[model samples]
Target: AACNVLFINSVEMESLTGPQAISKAVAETLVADPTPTATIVHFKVSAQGITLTDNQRKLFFRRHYPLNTVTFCDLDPQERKWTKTDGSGPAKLFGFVARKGSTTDNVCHLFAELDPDQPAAAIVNFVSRVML
Candidate 1:
C-alpha cells in the first residue's frame, strides 16, 4: 500500500546556476534551520504494504521552476533567477513538496510555501508538521 511520493524543493532563482550549487545551497539551508531536520528517506514497496528504510525520513530539495513562466510571484526577480547567495533568493522562492514517510496512502504528502515575509524559524516550524 505504498505510493510514490515526490519531494521537490523549488529554488527561487533570478539567474542560472549549476545543479550541484543549488543542491548544496538547499543542504546548507537545512543545516542552518533549527527545526524539521532534513534527511534522505529511501523507501520500497512490498506485497504486505509500503516498506521504508530506516533513513527514509530524509527529504530532498532541488531547483525547479514552473515552465512557461519565469517567476511565480509578482514581486521583483523571477523564479529562475533566485538563489541563496543573496537575500533576494527568498523573495523569488516558490514552494516545495516533500514525501511523508513511505506510504502509498494519499495522506503521505508534505507541501510548504516559502514566504519571504515570514521568519525562517516559522517556516521550519511549519515543515516540522510534515514529520508526523
Candidate 2:
C-alpha cells in the first residue's frame, strides 16, 4: 500500500503539568499542521502508578478529535479505536496505554501520526522505531 510515515528526527523530553494539558497541546499541534494524518498517542505514568483507565484515555482523544464513536476490542484491553460520525473526515485515531512498571516520578506521553494510505506493516515498523 502507498503510504507516508513521518518520524521524529529528534526528541527532547520535558515534564508537563497534567494529562489534560498534554492532550490539549497535542491537539493544537495537529490542528496547526499544514496536512493532518492518523494519530496515535501513548501514555505511561510513573509517580502515580500507571492504571490505564478507559474513561480517562478515551476522554482525552474525544475532547481533542471530532470522533463520534469510540470502541474497544475484546482481543486487547490496551487498545482503543475511534471514528468520526458519518464515517467521513480524518482517518481514525488509535490510542494505546500501558503501565510502565518503574519506580520513579515521571509520566511520559508520546504522539505520532501515520498516512492513511499506509499498510498495517508500515504502522508496525514505524512504532518499533519511535517506541525505543
Candidate 3:
C-alpha cells in the first residue's frame, strides 16, 4: 500500500529515561504498524537539564532498532535523518537535540515518517506541533 497519513497514529508508551526513553519511544511508536503507510514517530527525553553525552547520543541511533536496517544521514551537528533499507519504500526518520527556552538541559526530539516520498517540511511541521 502507498504511504497514507491516515494510517499513522501517535500512541503513547511508558515513560522512560535518558537515551533509553528515546529509543523505546521510537521503537514502540514505529512498531505499532506492521504495515505502516506513514507514521511520524515523535518523542522527547524526560531528563530535563541533562545533556546526553556524545557516546549516548550516538548510541541512541544505534539502539534505535536492533533488528532493522535503518540508515542515517548526518543532516548537521545537532541533527540526523534516517530511513529504512529493507526495500519497504521511502520511510524517513529525523531527530535533533536542542534546548527549549531558558532550560538548562537539552531536549531530544525524534520524528519518523513511513513514506519515503513524504516531504521533509511536512514531517518537520508535525514535529513542530509536538514541540509546542
Best by TM-score: 3
- Residues 1-132 of candidate 2 have per-residue lDDT tens digits of 113322211111132223333343344434443433333333222233222222222433421211111111011122222232224443323222222223222222323334455533444344334341
TM-score result, candidate 2: 0.24
Provide the global lDDT of candidate 2 against the true structure. 0.28
lDDT of 3 by residue, 1-132 (tens): 112221122222223334443454455545545643332232222223212222212323311221111122111232333344245554344443343333343333454454446554454444344332
* Residue 25, candidate 3: C-alpha displacement in angstroms: 16
TM-score of each: 0.22, 0.24, 0.28
Candidate 1 lDDT tens digits, 10-82: 3333232333334433443444444333222232323332233333343442222222221111111122322
Query: In terms of lDDT, which candidate is strongest?
Result: 3
Backbone clashes for every candidate come to 13, 0, 2
Minimum summed lDDT over a 10-residue window in model 1 is located at 68-77
lDDT ranking, best first: 3, 1, 2
Error of 3 at 75 (Å): 6.8
For model 2, the stretches where C-alpha displacement exceeds 4 angstroms are 1-78, 85-103, 106-114, 119-121
The predictions' CA RMSDs to the true structure, in order, are 16.4, 14.7, 14.5
Better of 2 and 3 by TM-score: 3
